[PDB]
């Protein structure tokens, strides 16, 4: 996260760290959506251009974390993966269309002050809140600058951007399964996701029921915090029927 701040304790209790077993290193962010299911970006697990194709046994998820590098004894919980599910139409060849994946945990995680699931949006909450200028919140342990790494989880609030501005900012083909967010050059304020924040959540607090909803997943961009560039996020609601199909069938 570039130009963010340190998270408060318990501020993002759905945050998940995807962690490689060997070498032990951070792979991506992710989010807790129930006691057994974690949501992330497909490119965190499968990206053939970079020779990335992880299997369940390669990975752990670490839940309840604040510090990036510490083992947070009596606070974080570490879970093994039962199964990875990648969207069947995830487009790793072109533009990361449908950049979404689910991970089922081997055992349910116990909720605590530090571990709690985020809601997924319904159609009406998405329609109300996914509007240009409305702000969401992005969290992660990724890089602090494009070209280092944080002691603790970072947080930044960013406005959703009008679709024509998103389209006009890049040569990559945008789809309805994406939205973009960030400040414009003339808005002065700054902030962005960066490499290592992949797969983490873009959340909004509904003003109707005072609950947090995950509207996006950190997906792609060009550089970090560049003027005139915006971060792109997987549109969770647009892909929710697939999420529900997977959870109903498997779970």
């Amino acid at each position: 996260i570039v130009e963010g701040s340190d998270a408060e304790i318990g501020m993002s209790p759905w945050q998940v760290m995807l962690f490689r077993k060997s070498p032990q290193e951070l792979l991506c962010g992710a989010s807790l959506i129930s006691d057994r299911w974690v949501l992330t970006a497909a490119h965190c697990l499968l990206y053939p251009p970079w020779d990335k194709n992880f299997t369940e046994n390669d990975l752990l998820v670490r839940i309840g974390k604040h510090s990036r590098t510490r083992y947070e004894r009596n606070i974080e919980k570490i879970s093994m993966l039962e199964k990875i599910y990648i969207h069947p139409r995830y487009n790793w060849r072109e533009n990361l269309d449908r950049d979404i994946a689910l991970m089922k945990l081997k055992k349910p995680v116990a909720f605590s002050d530090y571990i709690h699931p985020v809601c997924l949006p319904d159609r009406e909450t998405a329609a109300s809140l996914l509007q240009a200028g409305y702000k969401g919140r992005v969290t992660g342990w990724g890089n602090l600058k494009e070209t280092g790494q944080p002691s603790v989880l970072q947080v930044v609030n960013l406005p959703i951007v009008e679709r024509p501005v998103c389209k006009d900012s890049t040569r990559i083909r945008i789809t309805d399964n994406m939205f973009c967010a960030g400040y414009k050059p003339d808005e002065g304020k700054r902030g962005d996701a960066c490499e290592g924040d992949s797969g983490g959540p873009f959340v909004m607090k509904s003003p109707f029921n005072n609950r947090w909803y995950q509207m996006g997943i950190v997906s792609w961009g060009e550089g970090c915090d560049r003027d005139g560039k915006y971060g792109f996020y997987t549109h969770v609601f647009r892909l929710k029927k697939w999420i529900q199909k997977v959870i109903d069938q498997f779970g």
Binding site: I33, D113, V118, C119, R211
Partner: peptide, 28 residues
């Protein structure tokens, strides 16, 4: 689930975090 999106250390205690108001002010 029934309790999703309500944080133990914030909503469940009626405590706000330091920047959530910035989000609310943008929902116009």
């Amino acid at each position: 689930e029934a309790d999703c999106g309500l944080r133990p250390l914030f909503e469940k205690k009626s405590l706000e975090d330091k920047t959530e108001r910035e989000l609310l002010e943008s929902y116009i």
